[PDB]
Subunit: 234 residues, 3 copies
Amino acid sequence: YPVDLHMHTVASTHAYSTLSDYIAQAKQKGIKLFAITDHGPDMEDAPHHWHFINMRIWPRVVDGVGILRGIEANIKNVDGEIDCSGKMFDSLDLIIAGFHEPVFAPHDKATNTQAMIATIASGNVHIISHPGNPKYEIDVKAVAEAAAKHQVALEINNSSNCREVAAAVRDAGGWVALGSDSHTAFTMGEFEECLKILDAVDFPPERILNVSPRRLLNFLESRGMAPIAEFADL
Amino acid sequence: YPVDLHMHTVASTHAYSTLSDYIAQAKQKGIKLFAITDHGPDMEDAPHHWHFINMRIWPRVVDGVGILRGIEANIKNVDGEIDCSGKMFDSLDLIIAGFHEPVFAPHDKATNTQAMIATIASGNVHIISHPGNPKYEIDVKAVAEAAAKHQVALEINNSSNCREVAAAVRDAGGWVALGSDSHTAFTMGEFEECLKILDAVDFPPERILNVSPRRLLNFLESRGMAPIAEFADL
Amino acid sequence: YPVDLHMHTVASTHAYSTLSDYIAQAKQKGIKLFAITDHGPDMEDAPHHWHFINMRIWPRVVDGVGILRGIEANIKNVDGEIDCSGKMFDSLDLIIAGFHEPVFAPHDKATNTQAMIATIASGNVHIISHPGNPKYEIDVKAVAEAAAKHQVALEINNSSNCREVAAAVRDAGGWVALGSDSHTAFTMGEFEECLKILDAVDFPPERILNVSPRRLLNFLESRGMAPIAEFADL
Ligand code: NA
Ligand code: NA
Ligand code: NA
Ligand code: NA
Ligand code: NA
Ligand code: NA
Ligand code: NA
Ligand code: NA
Ligand code: NA
Ligand SMILES: [Zn+2]
Ligand SMILES: [Zn+2]
Ligand SMILES: [Zn+2]
């Protein structure tokens, strides 16, 4: 899997690598396409909203490695709103969203489930991060079914109910995304533990987004992204 | 033009490169002298004032590339004051100043013009950044005339009324400075678009500061900077 | 001395290098073990507490260089408390502590002395940073005696009453730690000025922690640190 979809830079002080560190490590590890997905601005220890707006200036391909502009947005409420403005959406390619205590504290199972499903149904998000987090109890099957319906991927997070999520996605028919949730570039692309979970449930390789740069880019285009010419050859 | 005078680091989250990234890219692109000019502390998403005071510890020359310590200060008011303290001036070599909405909102043409001219006449600034910004209407000729009188350069900004500024400087007799306004090191030294504007007005190469490291350093010394020995050989 | 124990990253905007910059410079300068010791969270221009908690994810050895997870904590009061929580202690290997005006303003000699000695006697700190700072008058002999008793090293800081501190430690029988207090990686391991102070007092090399990675690691283990297997070969 030459694609990693979830990692963080020094824009949060609880991460320690820069854009150039991720490019260099990708080069070393055979990763051909990666996304930087810094924490959304409503989070603690998070960057300013301009951090995301100004990603529009980034080079697309450096040293043969493609770079997606992303966000790990924060689910704000039971209506499925996230901390990403219209100007921010305009600059970004990949929208991940998830639960973080400073923004959305863990609540009753139904509150968590409704918020997650409303985020999925909003049409604004591509991947829900760490849905297996035991801190946020959810109706996994209902979430997987909604994710399949709205073509939203559920993440299996290497940084980490994950077998239950994987099996639920398998049966619901949706996509899985693998993400290292790296906070240094040293763990980019490392999915060993994710893969064991997927194997414990005989997850179909055909529904793993990270199989190839083209599979992932095709998914984003199906969700409405204008094609990125600079990524043709990936 | 082996000199670039305007770029930003991770000290603002809307920039993404470090000092070491700029050194490495300079090395790759044949840039022999560059200035880091982070946003002044009154700006949103800007670093602490100590970020500028502590630039006094930087090496002067790394891998053959000279490093100027700078600031893109913010014009604060119609008296021409900027967000740079005496201790900060003491640590810095290059003072750029300009209009940014969070500090000085766009106002009537006369308010903008008076503030810009007062900044020029203060004697504390070397370059006015993006004077051609249509968001801040100014009397371009009056600004160019004041800039020539006080030996302040007007910037032609590649990141970007620019032809009008260039022609005004040509006739007023002042200097132009080229700046990439890079927020990643990938665009360091890239002035293609600046050069087209200058060519559309047959701007005299003799009044472009970036022609050589020595021309730029001679300008700073004429404005009062003690000579930097470590830069002799540039 | 292939060990440097005190340096800072971009997590403070008054520092300019990243973890990867320090690894690369260590490699270049023959440093085999270094500690990142960013300013504690109560300081101005300092990172969030999560910056220290999440250091638990760092690789231990990169390109042959070992990496200690540290903090330059701030002495908070005359009871010897510092701005380091239990969760933070759990993630860190090296605890440095010192006086910084925004947290603990310079006061009477007895106030400064009591706070420093209480920090030493707390058992939570390994090194007291810049005890020779003339801004904070202390009873040097009393501090050195307490440091020897509680097996706390006093720093001789290259960034910088230092001869008096060195002679006091010599006679009290404690350890000295050398630290560059680097705010860029370009000065990592540079102790020339520290060594002159130590030579002016014929300081015994046997009580300089930085002599070898193993001497330093043995000291941390004697203070209660579980052994770091990944550092066996250093
Ligand atoms: Na978009
Ligand atoms: Na997360
Ligand atoms: Na994350
Ligand atoms: Na100056
Ligand atoms: Na600007
Ligand atoms: Na700028
Ligand atoms: Na510890
Ligand atoms: Na200090
Ligand atoms: Na320090
Ligand atoms: Zn995080
Ligand atoms: Zn900017
Ligand atoms: Zn500092």
